[PDB]
Amino acid sequence: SSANNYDLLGQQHKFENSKVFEEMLVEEEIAKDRELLEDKNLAVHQLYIFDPQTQLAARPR
Amino acid sequence: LYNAMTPAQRYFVEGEHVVQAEANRDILFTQLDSNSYLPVLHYVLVGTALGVVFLVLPLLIVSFYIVSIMYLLFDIEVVYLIPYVMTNATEYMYWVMQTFVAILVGGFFYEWRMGALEWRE
């Protein structure tokens, strides 16, 4: 079990470390906008529903 | 039937003939009862009685909430606009009305932009 668990851990760490700088920055902006958009009474929330993984407008509300 | 109770209301006319004539009078628009809503209430009573007679004869033998609020607020805005149409406006009365309309059109634009006017919800 320990070996298999560390294999899964290795895969996760490989995934996180391998992303290029431009992607890491873009993900930092995604996370920041996720934090800003936590408030649901914002005007922009009424306009559209945002995709959870990437805070991009998915559909109109 | 409203009746004058003072000499000044009766145009300082003396005698008891006038009082009797006033009390037994008919509702005429070209006499003492102009712009009177008493006929309207006589009409309401007649209509109610007519319905009551029909009713008794056989016996013997979220979007909606939004539309209601928008309706109420636009209705009050139109209520404000009604006095303006009832006056011969000047240039400044026109510009005050234009400011009022601008505020109303801004609220309408907010409703349109935010998707309230669309009824999908």
* B115 with A43: Cβ contact below 8 A: no
Query: Count of A–B CB contacts within 8 Å?
Result: 8
CA distances from B93 to A56, B76, B110 (A): 48, 19, 26
Residue A61: CB atoms within 10 A of its CB come to 15
Q: In a 10 Å sphere around its CB, with 0-12 CB exposed, 13-18 middle and 19+ buried, how is residue B107 labelled?
A: middle
* B114 with A46: Cβ contact below 8 A: yes
A60 CB within 8 Å of a chain B CB: yes
- What distance in Å separates the CA atoms of residue B9 and residue B29, rounded to the nearest whole number? 18
Q: With CA atoms as reference, report the closest residue to B120 among A28, A33, A12, A59.
A: A59
3-state helix, strand, coil in chain B (%, to 5): 65, 0, 35
Name chain A contacts of B62, Cβ cutoff 8 Å.
none
Break positions in chain B: residue before each gap, C to N over 2.5 angstroms: 61
Angle CA B111–B116–B121, to nearest 5? 175
A42 CB within 8 Å of a chain B CB: no
Which residues share a beta bridge with A48? A60
Which residues share a beta bridge with A49? A59
Q: Which pair of structure tokens corresponds to residue A57?
A: 């407008």
The nearest alpha carbon in chain A to B116 belongs to A46
Helix (H, G, I), strand (E, B) or coil at A50: strand
Deposited resolution, Å: 3.0
A46 CB within 8 Å of a chain B CB: yes
